[PDB]
Design a protein around this ligand. Structure first.
Ligand code: NAG
Ligand code: CA
Ligand code: CA
Ligand code: CA
Ligand code: CL
Ligand code: CL
Lengths: 267, 265
């Protein structure tokens, strides 16, 4: 039994591993290790391919999705794994396992500013900060920033800067560009805290740090086909790997704080 | 119309008794009740609630049977179980949980005015009684953590030495309501759901207690259904929708009102 796995490159969840010339691509990372653990415990083989458009996928027309979600809908893949958050729109068309890691949004910024919280960022006048335009993060801040029911003004202030002039002034086209702009200075990039944490830990110049928050609204999941017979099985083993600590060990492996950049060097 | 049988246990502010006149059935209220109400409205079912006869969440016994609400689902006396139930692998093996509708972690309830401000501070205590509910999933959590040689710091082992003293008899309590009462009295720190002890501190008549959190979240609260229940996936989808729209945040603010209540700082 061999399962067809679709993925998208994103450090440190899924990364290209060294392969000999003339031999097929290999992959490594936190999500690969989770997948391997499931394959060993459940006893299956798998083969990986990258989404032809490199996209997680969104809806274009009724039933028309691109990206990895589209690959599952058309049943070209049995499952998708990368850094995919569990959302209701995606769960209505495919079937997610229970989460194997929590997701939240963080801030990547150069070390040495007085900014230490999301509230501090929101108080900034004239400072450029933002996220990937037309992303889920963008839409999250839209919803929180236009809702009169928020207890703290923090979200309205952040959205005013992020969305300025339609999101064209302060947002970027990709996480790699956002990471690159934050390292150069005079910009703070809002994105997956796990993604920017790894970028900060491996920064050639150890020049950046990450601000997180207590607000975790979603989990990372494995996406399977609609009606897949394996979804509940994956959920059960994922709960077991969490409870034994195997997941925490893998997280420590791929987000190692010793031997890498000190994110708290300005304290 | 279609009516589901719901089993629960009382834990403030998740499920609480709301009104009980003689000649009328018990009514319930709380965060978990409002989550259940939204699912009932959206999926078109009614429901009737009863309390687990042994008042337990449920765990496995030596003959592989289960007590508590879990046992009520296995026997098919209940169609679903809801209160403040954590999704664990042992339970999911015998019942089917929705995806979580809230995150869970362990906190400490303690009187204000002590130098104890973290779990590490608590673990350093020499003379002090602190613990959790005996024979609970929280007791088993500190057992697993306290006996793990792979733990980086001695904190969990030290906590376990105090919690487990004399097989747990000395420093643990029989119920959360006993743990809360003893922390409010003083000279006892109670370890339990951060959300349960936060409500106790927010609503303290004297505003005399506080909560130490900082514990990372490993688990979620879920609704438990029978094995193979056709409603598990429908519930998960609607829960994800209630989160996405902000409705679950509104309900959390309703039942954990920070403004107008005790300052915990
Ligand atoms: C299993 O053990 C419990 C606790 O002693 C007991 O109440 C129950 O009747 C037992 N069930 C059997 C024999 O299946
Ligand atoms: Ca689905
Ligand atoms: Ca199950
Ligand atoms: Ca099923
Ligand atoms: Cl989940
Ligand atoms: Cl699920």
């Amino acid at each position: 039994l061999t399962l067809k796995v679709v993925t998208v490159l994103e450090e440190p969840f899924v990364m290209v591993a060294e392969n000999i010339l003339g031999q097929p691509k290999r992959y490594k990372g936190f999500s690969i290790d989770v997948l391997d653990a499931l394959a060993k415990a459940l006893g299956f083989k798998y083969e990986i391919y990258q989404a032809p458009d490199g996209r997680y996928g969104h809806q274009l027309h009724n039933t028309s999705w691109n990206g990895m979600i589209g690959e599952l809908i058309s049943k070209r893949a049995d499952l998708a794994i990368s850094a995919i958050t569990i959302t209701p729109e995606r769960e209505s068309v495919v079937d997610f396992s229970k989460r194997y890691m929590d997701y939240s949004v963080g801030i990547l910024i150069k070390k040495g500013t007085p900014i230490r919280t999301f509230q501090d960022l929101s108080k900034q006048v004239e400072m450029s900060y933002g996220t990937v335009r037309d992303s889920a993060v963008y839409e999250y801040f839209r919803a929180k920033g236009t809702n009169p029911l928020e207890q703290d003004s923090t979200f309205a202030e952040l959205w005013r800067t992020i969305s300025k002039n339609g999101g064209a002034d302060n947002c970027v086209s990709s996480p790699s560009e956002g990471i690159r702009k934050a390292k150069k200075g005079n910009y703070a990039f809002l994105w997956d805290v796990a993604v920017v944490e790894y970028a900060a830990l491996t920064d050639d110049d150890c020049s950046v740090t990450v601000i997180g928050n207590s607000i975790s609204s979603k989990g990372y999941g494995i996406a399977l086909q609609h009606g897949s017979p394996y979804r509940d099985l994956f959920s059960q083993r994922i709960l077991e790997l969490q409870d034994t600590g195997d997941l925490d060990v893998l997280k420590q492996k791929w987000w190692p704080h010793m031997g890498r950049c000190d994110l708290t060097s300005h304290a």
